Design a protein around this ligand. Structure first.
Ligand SMILES: [Br-]
Length: 208
């Protein structure tokens, strides 16, 4: 379909908070190691004052901390969700389906991704590398999209409605049952992966 409206609003929501794009990659790479990430550690890595790291993170109100106040989730997370994101043997999680398609390129690793169809509970899995997906099981796997909303934390506006599905027909039936989500649409995981690729492209250009 026409995906420009989705990319454009996702890029905008991200660029709405200055520095987000700059903090994102270095934090995903740290979280990908499997251990909580200190905010002070993050500030050294960005060579930023602690204040700027703080302001960026308090915009993502979904940001997860542990009991020591260390970062344990930002897109990628150490706390179980229904999207499993395995790098090496390390079993990490993602907040949404599209995360699992865009993060491999940002952290430069290949992930073994798994979840369950949000319509039927069926197991889904795929391997996502920085440049391609492989081992798509079942082959017809789909993803839901909605129009990202402006002036709202990204997880809560957009990708809480961004799931995997066993197939496009199964997903379209699920989607017809919902009709109060702006821009609700179903795409193949291949098309989803392409959106992710275009998002990442603009995203990287936005870094300093
Ligand atoms: Br369009």
């Amino acid at each position: 379909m026409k995906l420009a409206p989705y990319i454009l609003e996702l890029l905008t929501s991200v660029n709405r908070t200055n520095g987000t794009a700059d903090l994102l990659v270095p934090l995903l790479r740290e979280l990908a190691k499997g251990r909580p990430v200190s905010r002070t550690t993050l500030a050294g890595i960005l060579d930023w004052p602690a204040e700027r790291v703080a302001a960026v993170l308090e915009q993502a109100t979904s940001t997860e901390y542990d009991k020591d106040g260390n970062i344990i989730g930002y897109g990628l997370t150490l706390r179980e969700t229904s999207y499993v994101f395995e790098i090496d043997d390390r079993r990490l999680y993602a907040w949404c389906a599209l995360d699992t398609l865009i993060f491999p390129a940002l952290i430069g690793r290949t992930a073994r991704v798994s979840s369950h169809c949000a319509a039927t509970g069926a197991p889904v899995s795929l391997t996502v590398s920085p440049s391609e997906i492989q081992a798509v099981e079942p082959a017809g796997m789909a993803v839901s999209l909605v129009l990202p909303q402006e002036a709202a934390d990204v997880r809560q506006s957009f990708c809480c409605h961004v799931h995997f599905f066993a197939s496009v027909p199964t997903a379209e039936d699920w989607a017809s049952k919902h009709q109060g989500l702006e821009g609700l649409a179903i795409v193949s995981v291949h098309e989803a992966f392409g959106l992710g690729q275009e998002f990442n492209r603009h995203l990287l250009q936005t870094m300093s």
